[PDB]
Amino acid sequence: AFHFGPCRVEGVVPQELWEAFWAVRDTLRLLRAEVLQNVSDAESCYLVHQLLRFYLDTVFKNYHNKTAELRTLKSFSTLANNFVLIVSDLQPCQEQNMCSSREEAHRRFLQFQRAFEQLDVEAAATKALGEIDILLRWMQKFYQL
Ligand code: NI
């Protein structure tokens, strides 16, 4: 399962995320891999939750081309569904006050958001979708057998 600090996420595994991403990518830095690499185990619950919420609330919404044809919409939907299933475990860990969010952690999310907001939002959304490989390579560090 995934172990994002104290939060165990059981509904989704990396193989599912990767196969969903490659389908999305096939239809198509804000995230600094070096920054994500040094995020503590403890901080991971907050930061994964914040980033996946941002994808679900801002990125997919602002990516116009997801409705170009039904197969494309289905591919995007599969990927978003995987993110929702992860957040459905992380949200309760936050609302039971399980996940730390030190000032440093909020500032790492703000670094991402500042970069995203430099661009026109449709271009930003397109770029952020392309960077899901960065996100998933980081997230899978928290996946154990
Ligand atoms: Ni906090």
Distance from Cα 16 to the centre of ligand 1, integer Å: 30
Contact in structure between 111 and 51 (CB atoms under 8 Å): no
Please state, in angstroms and rounded to a whole number, the distance separating the CA atoms of residues 140 and 17: 10
Measured in Å, residue 99 CA sits from the centre of ligand 1 at 9
d(CA 79, CA 60): 10
Q: How far is the CA of 26 from the centre of ligand 1 (A)?
A: 37
Place of tokens 């994808």: 55
Nearest one of 63, 80, 64, 71 to 16, comparing CA atoms: 80
How far apart CA 91 and CA 96 sit, in angstroms, is 9
Q: How far is CA 43 from the centre of its chain?
A: 15
Integer Cα distance of 126 and 112 in angstroms: 15
CA of 67 to the centre of ligand 1 (A): 36
Domain ranges of the chain: 1-145
Distance 107 CA to ligand 1 centre (A): 10
Which residues pair with residue 4 across a beta bridge? 7
Q: Are 19 and 75 in contact (CB under 8 A)?
A: no
Backbone φ and ψ for 43, nearest 5 degrees, come out as -70, -20
Alpha helices in 60-118 (DSSP H): 60-62, 70-95, 103-118
